[PDB]
Amino acid sequence: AFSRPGLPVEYLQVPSASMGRDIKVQFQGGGPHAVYLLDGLRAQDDYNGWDINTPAFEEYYQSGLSVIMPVGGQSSFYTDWYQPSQSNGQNYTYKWETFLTREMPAWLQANKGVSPTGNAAVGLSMSGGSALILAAYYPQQFPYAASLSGFLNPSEGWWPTLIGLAMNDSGGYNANSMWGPSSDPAWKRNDPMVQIPRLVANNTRIWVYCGNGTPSDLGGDNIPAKFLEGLTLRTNQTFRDTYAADGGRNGVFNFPPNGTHSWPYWNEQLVAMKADIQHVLNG
């Protein structure tokens, strides 16, 4: 990520009892509250996409916030799966919600002094919705959530099909093993649109970036770009309108015409929200 010399980035091995393996975590300490930077659909096992593609660590150096980049979890949606992914030979069950909400914060509190409460969850593409869902169900841990080009209504219309095809294109993962058939309650449970009343009741500070142009990680679905763009626009508009109609009053919604679904503009948003996170989490 082309950091300037002299920056204290660490790589940690954090045991996950629920997944029966160690999870690598890239870490920069800087204060008791942290920004959890979640990865996209094609998350690798060596480095988090934020560190591969952006200067996130340097941008948040001496911000008064710690930065946590978990590594791994391709196509996981940072959720707890029903079962090991059926077809690609996965030999354990993804339990990334358990890891992010229980196992990892316990480790970081005991060893780093990072507070398990009062943090920000920031996700993009696959994990944009994850960040909102984490805030919806764990508001003490995440009073702040940002979704950058997230799937804001994964249980509706075209989205279960498109997500299923995207997960197969990203490591051959099976959405059915994750949340069941699209009729299963897990799809609505993990749908940010459906959980808007929780975000409102929690008074979650939400930062929602809506990009333009060709969506990301949908490259293998054999569908015209403009159709995907139309679906995305409609779903994003519905999310914003529903948040307002349901009494939401703690949101930032960003829809710049030249914004794209890409690391450069996801970084642009991460930088733009820094003062916002600082004021909300640290006064």
* Residue 281 known to bind ligand: no
* Residue 111 known to bind ligand: no
Respond yes or no: is residue 63 known to be catalytic. Answer: no
Count the residues in the chain.
283
How far is residue 106's CA from residue 108's CA, in Å, rounded to a whole number? 6
* Residue 263 known to bind ligand: yes
* Residue 236 known to bind ligand: no
* Residue 124 known to bind ligand: no
Q: In a 10 Å sphere around its CB, with 0-12 CB exposed, 13-18 middle and 19+ buried, how is residue 81 labelled?
A: buried
Catalytic residue of the set 16, 125, 130, 170: 125
* Residue 179 known to bind ligand: no
* Residue 218 known to bind ligand: no
Catalytic residue of the set 33, 66, 130, 261: 261
Respond yes or no: is residue 229 known to be catalytic. Answer: yes
Comparing CA positions, the residue from 149, 135, 120, 144 lying closest to residue 269 is 149
How far is residue 64's CA from residue 16's CA, in Å, rounded to a whole number? 28
* Residue 232 known to bind ligand: yes
For helices 159-169 and 225-245, what crossing angle results, to 10°? 120
* Residue 279 known to bind ligand: no
Per the CB < 8 A criterion, the answer to whether 221 and 160 are in contact is: no
Q: In 10 A of CB 227, how many CB atoms?
A: 11
Respond yes or no: is residue 10 known to be catalytic. Answer: no
**Sequence ranges of the binding site for substrate:** 41-42, 125, 153, 231-234, 238, 261-263
**Sequence ranges of the binding site:** 41-42, 125, 153, 231-234, 238, 261-263
Catalytic residues, which ones? 125, 229, 261
